[PDB]
Design a protein around this nucleic acid. Structure first.
Lengths: 93, 103, 84, 98, 93, 107, 84, 98
DNA sequence: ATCGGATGTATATATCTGACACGTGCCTGGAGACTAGGGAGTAATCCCCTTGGCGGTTAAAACGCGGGGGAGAATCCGTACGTGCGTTTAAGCGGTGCTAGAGCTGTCTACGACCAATTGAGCGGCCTCGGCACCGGGATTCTCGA
DNA sequence: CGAGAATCCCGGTGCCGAGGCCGCTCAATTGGTCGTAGACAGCTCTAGCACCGCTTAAACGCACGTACGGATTCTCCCCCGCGTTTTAACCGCCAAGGGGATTACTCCCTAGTCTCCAGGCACGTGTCAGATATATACATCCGAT
């Protein structure tokens, strides 16, 4: 039975950021769990915030506000900058 | 046919995350296309942030591959990442530290 | 097919508690620490196992699973990484 | 006379060893037996997965290590070097458990 | 401009248990907030339980497992007793 | 046209709770009819449990109405309710208690 | 229309801190307790107010509301009853 | 000589009074001014609701009372009757704040 | 201060293996192309309530001083815990066997959602008088020093 | 081991907030239809459980000694209690206008349904990164001087 995982994308990012070092199976599983946890937090906060303002659509504003609420400080600043750069790159295509 | 993950210049999937986001709304939710792309870039940045710190500690130990021990060192070494991640790493050990009074 | 256990908390020996304390970073230990630690560990295990048994009961199964244990630990706010 | 270390240095050496090490510290078979006895009360004739037992062991060890760190902090605050049940009780009370 | 609240139901329960006692507005608001909090906790736990087993509906089994997970001990057993008695009464009716 | 909340012998609403539950499930989520009836029974029981203890505390003060102070006394005094409700009551005060060693004169 | 405030943390006076301590149930107070308490209160207020400001800024509003304050407190795991 | 109380009995009387009473303890106008001063950093030219200000004051007093109780527990454990900044720091450290 | 054996600990040497890393073959799910409609943005308007200011009053805060009780530092006793040795115990590893129970596929069958009236339940506004806040006067109980 | 002071009851006065009543309107009820979620029945085959024997690492009990936890005094200085003098919070009242809360209109963005084909998942195989010994080199430790 097919099971979905983030291992390929994590390995792509690892090869981009460090062209020589490798990874182990337990470390890959830990990274998978960490990514799942973060995504669950972001989705829950966005859904709650969207319900909070009598809305029914999850657009970029709720996700930006959610990451601002969750991530602390310069992590939030850099994440917001990366997200808006990605959004502009998408729209300008 | 151009993949949506390549138009935004990312590595994480966009269509797959869009499917997952739509399955976690409340009984009527509409998910914008731009929402998935914004969330994909957040995950890629955080993943690239941790692997940068973990990879640095692996080189300091004159070793090649990354073990769960190195992940614990990088996270606890970071102050922000320590605050963000409170989960327990299996096989990660502890940061060595001895109080002044005991010596 | 089945068996009974009568007293198993004594399997957590004194050297094991000493090793846990050394990893925690203490230098000198008293005498009643072992009994106190056994009681605390029993309470923690009882809570976690009760939650896991509820989870595996709801699914109409007969074997407890690591996934149920992970769900119980997450519910108690003690999230564990490295098991799914 | 045979060489004898002063009381305390071996404790520090063990601290360094077990802090740089990264494996489990309790015996797996007694832990399994204790887990089965505890779990038998809620439901009879259960079966377990080895991964589940190992996960329980890691969680218990991490909790115990954190509790011992807090207890050592309390003992240091009380101007002592030995940890006591009163230190353990104070730590658990402040953490809000019982 | 219609607001919804549980004030009349709280008053009915109060008149049932203590036939000659009153209530203040602040206490009524606190009771409303507490009821909302419990409702939201129960709904979230039930939804997560349904998602865990790849189901798509909320039933009395989901609600009973959620209240057993949340309520401690005596409260849990008494609450599930009232729940099952109410359910069998509704079904027989 | 009998009420659905009257068929189960309750006082809390059932149709309103069913509507509220259906606007809380995930996408393409259904809600069973008996789920609302089961959920309303728990809410009524918990409300009746808290209100009984609050009235008992109020009656010892020879008053007729219930204030937020009485809610704090009943909730914190009981054991199981305290472990369930961790929120802050606006204006509820605290439970009087002085430590043994603080009481001076050694008596 | 607007103004500025230069140092308002001194408004939390020594009698007020002493009354808070008396309600908490202490008998004798040292001297640096007031400065430490002012620092702690400033940090806590900064966190809560930042969360509330984010909440009210998301809604394109200009006035902070008790609903936003309650939401921030709940997000911080400090749920408050009696305001909706 | 004029009637003078011994150190401690008046403190206990204040303890009883403020433990049985249930009103606010900090001055509303200085608290409002402090709240506005803190809030002007994040966004300029904001307006507030009285209910929001009252909720903030409620939460602040509750948190301060809880922290003071934990500090008193620490001070009692250290075999003293006076609370100290080190007691406050130990309580906050064990609770996991900073 | 040496000083000097003893002994844990770190290094740079073969060696052997099993665990990452990559190549292949599918196949299920992501990517275009229209289409419809319902949610959200935008403009206009009403009016609630938030801000700013003025003046009197009094409760609360700031200041200063006397002193008694608590925090901290030295000094001793003895007993409980750490360090080694010689036994004794059962954990651990390596096999073998076996069946209870977790997954996986199909079949209806019974559930729950949608739609169109329709009417009573619950929300908003309005009174009103009694529960409760406030005030004044005894009664009682601590508490400190003769 | 009494008198001063703080507190607790007890009775009277007033006042505004809780409880009930009335109008009304919108969403809970009731039939009737229809689509699909899943409750069972059967089958596969995985792995959790139960023995059996040898090795040996590690608990276990005992002896001895020393150093750390309390116990006891003793000093001094720091925070508490109380009286005076400022001061600014508080309450009542007024005034103006910004911005929150509704309403109507329009438009555009996303869900749904087909086609289609190519990124990921399972599976297999190889070779080299890292366990494992180990023989020195040495960095401390503690008794002796």
């Amino acid at each position: 039975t097919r099971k979905e995982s983030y291992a390929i994308y994590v390995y792509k990012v690892l090869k981009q950021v460090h062209p020589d070092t490798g990874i182990s199976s337990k470390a890959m599983s830990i990274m998978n769990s960490f990514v799942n946890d973060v995504f669950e937090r972001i989705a829950g906060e966005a859904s709650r915030l969207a319900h909070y303002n009598k809305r029914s659509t999850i657009t970029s504003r709720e996700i930006q506000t959610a990451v601002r609420l969750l991530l602390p400080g310069e992590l939030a600043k850099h994440a917001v900058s990366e997200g808006t750069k990605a959004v502009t790159k998408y729209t300008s295509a | 046919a151009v993949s949506r993950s390549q138009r935004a210049g990312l590595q994480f999937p966009v269509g797959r995350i869009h499917r997952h986001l739509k399955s976690r709304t409340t009984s009527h939710g509409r998910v914008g296309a731009t929402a998935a792309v914004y969330s994909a870039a957040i995950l890629e940045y955080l993943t690239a942030e941790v692997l940068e710190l973990a990879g640095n500690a692996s080189k300091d130990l004159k070793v090649k591959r990354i073990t769960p021990r190195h992940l614990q060192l990088a996270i606890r070494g970071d102050e922000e990442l320590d605050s963000l991640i409170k989960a327990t790493i299996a096989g990660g050990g502890v940061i060595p530290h001895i109080h002044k009074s005991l010596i | 097919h089945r068996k009974v256990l009568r007293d198993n908390i004594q399997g957590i020996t004194k050297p094991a508690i000493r090793r846990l304390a050394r990893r925690g970073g203490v230098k000198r230990i008293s005498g009643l620490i072992y009994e106190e630690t056994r009681g605390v560990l029993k309470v923690f295990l009882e809570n976690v196992i009760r939650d896991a048994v509820t989870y595996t009961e709801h699914a109409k199964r007969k074997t407890v699973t690591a996934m149920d244990v992970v769900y119980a630990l997450k519910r108690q706010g003690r999230t564990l990484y490295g098991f799914g | 006379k045979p060489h004898r270390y002063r009381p305390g240095t071996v404790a520090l050496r063990e601290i360094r060893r077990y802090q740089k090490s990264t494996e489990l510290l309790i015996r797996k078979l007694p832990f399994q037996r204790l887990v089965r006895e505890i779990a038998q009360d809620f439901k009879t004739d259960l079966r377990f997965q080895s991964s589940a037992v190992m996960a329980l062991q890691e969680a218990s060890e991490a909790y115990l290590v954190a509790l011992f760190e807090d207890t050592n902090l309390c003992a240091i605050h009380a101007k002592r070097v030995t940890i006591m049940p009163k230190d353990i009780q104070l730590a658990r009370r402040i953490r809000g458990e019982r």
